[PDB]
Amino acid sequence: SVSKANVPKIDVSPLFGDDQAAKMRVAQQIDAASRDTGFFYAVNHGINVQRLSQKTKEFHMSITPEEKWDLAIRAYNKEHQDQVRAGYYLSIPGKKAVESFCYLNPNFTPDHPRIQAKTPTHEVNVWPDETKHPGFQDFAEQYYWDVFGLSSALLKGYALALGKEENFFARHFKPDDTLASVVLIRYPYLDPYPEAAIKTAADGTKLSFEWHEDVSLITVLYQSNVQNLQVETAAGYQDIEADDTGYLINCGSYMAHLTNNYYKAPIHRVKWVNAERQSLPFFVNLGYDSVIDPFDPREPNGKSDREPLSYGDYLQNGLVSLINKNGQT
Ligand SMILES: CC(C)[C@@H](NC(=O)[C@H](CS)NC(=O)CCC[C@H](N)C(=O)O)C(=O)O
Numbered sequence: 080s081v082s083k084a085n086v087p088k089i090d091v092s093p094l095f096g097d098d099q100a101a102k103m104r105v106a107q108q109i110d111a112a113s114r115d116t117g118f119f120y121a122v123n124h125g126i127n128v129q130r131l132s133q134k135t136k137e138f139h140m141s142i143t144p145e146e147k148w149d150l151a152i153r154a155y156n157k158e159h160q161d162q163v164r165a166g167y168y169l170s171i172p173g174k175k176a177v178e179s180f181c182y183l184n185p186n187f188t189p190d191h192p193r194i195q196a197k198t199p200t201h202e203v204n205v206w207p208d209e210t211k212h213p214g215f216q217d218f219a220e221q222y223y224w225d226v227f228g229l230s231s232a233l234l235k236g237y238a239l240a241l242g243k244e245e246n247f248f249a250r251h252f253k254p255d256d257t258l259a260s261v262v263l264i265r266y267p268y269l270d271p272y273p274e275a276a277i278k279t280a281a282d283g284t285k286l287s288f289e290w291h292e293d294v295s296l297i298t299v300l301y302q303s304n305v306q307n308l309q310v311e312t313a314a315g316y317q318d319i320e321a322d323d324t325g326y327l328i329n330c331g332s333y334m335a336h337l338t339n340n341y342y343k344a345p346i347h348r349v350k351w352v353n354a355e356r357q358s359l360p361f362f363v364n365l366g367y368d369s370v371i372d373p374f375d376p377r378e379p380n381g382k383s384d385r386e387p388l389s390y391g392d393y394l395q396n397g398l399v400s401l402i403n404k405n406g407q408t
Pocket residue numbers: 163164165181260262264288291293294300349358360362398401408
């Protein structure tokens with residue numbers, strides 16, 4: 080009644096090295112995965128995900144309602160009009176099970192020119208008290224750059240897969256202006272589980288989050304070992320097996336745009352599971368002014384009749400639309 084999707088596990092370690100042929104074989108595997116279901120697992124990535132899960136758990140389980148209010152985004156706290164992206168996404172006992180904490184580029188400070196110019200989507204991160212959550216901010220900022228490094232290498236594999244020089248994407252993925260974000264999501268075990276937090280799909284499947292396309296260039300996701308994701312194919316939704324040692328990768332609607340849908344943004348949804356688990360996405364976003372000219376790999380000339388799309392305008396409209404369709408997280 081429900082089959083399983085083919086999600087290959089790609090050894091991405093050659094993307095850090097100098098062997099050019101080895102990197103082409105990795106690119107071929109990305110091309111194959113990106114043309115099939117759209118998902119693949121990155122293995123041999125060199126990020127310590129045990130420390131990731133541990134520190135994220137200690138933070139989620141030790142934060143108090145008082146601290147949540149102080150870190151809340153404007154959707155939950157009228158006083159924080161400047162917190163549209165970064166801050167805490169409170170759960171609602173009896174109505175909403177999920178909660179999360181989002182933070183952005185640690186370089187976004189009051190001295191940063193984008194912050195001074197008050198450019199949309201740019202915000203300064205808010206953190207809990209170092210005394211109540213010792214070492215959390217240091218760990219979170221370090222992880223941001225660890226996963227930034229992995230993302231930079233993956234984008235070289237995507238560039239080689241499409242026939243471009245390995246810096247075709249990475250040249251727009253810079254530490255000093257990237258709009259990428261880290262989200263630390265908790266899916267709690269609840270007994271009883273509130274029926275108001277469970278959505279019923281058209282095919283009857285119980286969901287925690289409805290179908291969607293990612294607002295990103297690529298999505299780099301770590302999850303605990305609890306099956307939950309489903310990818311849409313022509314023959315219905317397929318389960319994505321879980322793996323808590325690797326990173327699940329998939330393209331966003333910005334990749335689909337600039338490749339004229341050669342690399343589709345796979346539609347996927349989150350099944351409902353009453354289990355304590357973690358979902359830790361890192362959304363690979365470019366700079367607010369970053370523009371990549373669209374092209375079509377299918378065409379010998381690569382000519383495409385698609386308008387170039389500023390990543391700032393794409394992200395701004397994309398985040399809003401995702402809230403109107405699937406709701407406030
Ligand atoms: C599918 C998972 C990655 C995860 N879902 C998600 O993270 C969902 C769908 S990709 N993403 C969002 O709601 C957008 C968060 C963007 C963030 N606040 C920001 O300022 O950039 C889950 O487990 O719900």
